[PDB]
Amino acid sequence: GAMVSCPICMDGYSEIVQNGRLIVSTECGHVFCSQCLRDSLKNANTCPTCRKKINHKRYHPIYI
Amino acid sequence: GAMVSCPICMDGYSEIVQNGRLIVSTECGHVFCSQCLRDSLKNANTCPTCRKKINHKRYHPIYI
Ligand SMILES: OC[C@H]1O[C@@](CO)(O[C@H]2O[C@H](CO)[C@@H](O)[C@H](O)[C@H]2O)[C@@H](O)[C@@H]1O
Ligand SMILES: OC[C@H]1O[C@@](CO)(O[C@H]2O[C@H](CO)[C@@H](O)[C@H](O)[C@H]2O)[C@@H](O)[C@@H]1O
Ligand SMILES: [Zn+2]
Ligand SMILES: [Zn+2]
Ligand SMILES: [Zn+2]
Ligand SMILES: [Zn+2]
């Protein structure tokens, strides 16, 4: 358990994990829920926060 | 701001960031404070949690 919020949907950890989503981080350290990041990746290969490229799986779950 | 705790020192986010440390994640998704992970890396090249190899900078800050 943790208290972190996804900046795209603005849900808290409780709401994210209740819905079966993962907390994920880009390799540039930007944290989102899995759904928002994967959805962003359908339209853009860049980090939603800093626009560094994150395709080729330069992101991963964080187990918190 | 976030509420996460480092499993090695067991400090909360407030105490970690007050002390100038970073929150970091391994690429295997395991979250620590920077001091504990870097200290672990002096003795072992493996994740403190799952023992997957994490040297060659297979870890990074998470900005929460
Ligand atoms: O929802 C992700 C969140 O759940 C935790 C347990 O609190 O991990 C569990 O759920 C994941 C998603 O189904 C699994 O991948 C994982 O193996 C399981 O322990 C947190 O670690 C994670 O942040
Ligand atoms: O202590 C890390 C923690 O601080 C935040 C702000 O709450 O980031 C700031 O501090 C970092 C460490 O000095 C800097 O690298 C960063 O640029 C700065 O914004 C969090 O994002 C971070 O988790
Ligand atoms: Zn989200
Ligand atoms: Zn980024
Ligand atoms: Zn620690
Ligand atoms: Zn690990």
Protein residues with C-beta less than 5 angstroms from the ion ligand 3: A 6, 8-9, 33, 36
Experimental method: X-ray
H helical segments located in chain A: 13-18, 34-43
Instruction: Give dist(CA A14, CA B22) in Å, integer.
Output: 23
Query: Number of structural domains, chain B?
Result: 1
Instruction: Give dist(CA B57, CA A44) in Å, integer.
Output: 26
Instruction: Give dist(CA A33, CA A17) in Å, integer.
Output: 9
Query: Which chain A residues are Cβ-neighbours of B14 within 8 angstroms?
Result: none
Its domain, for residue B46, covers 1-64
CATH number, domain of A26, equals 3.30.40.10
Q: How many Å lie between the centroid of ligand 6 and the Cα of residue A49?
A: 25
Instruction: Give dist(CA A51, CA A32) in Å, integer.
Output: 14
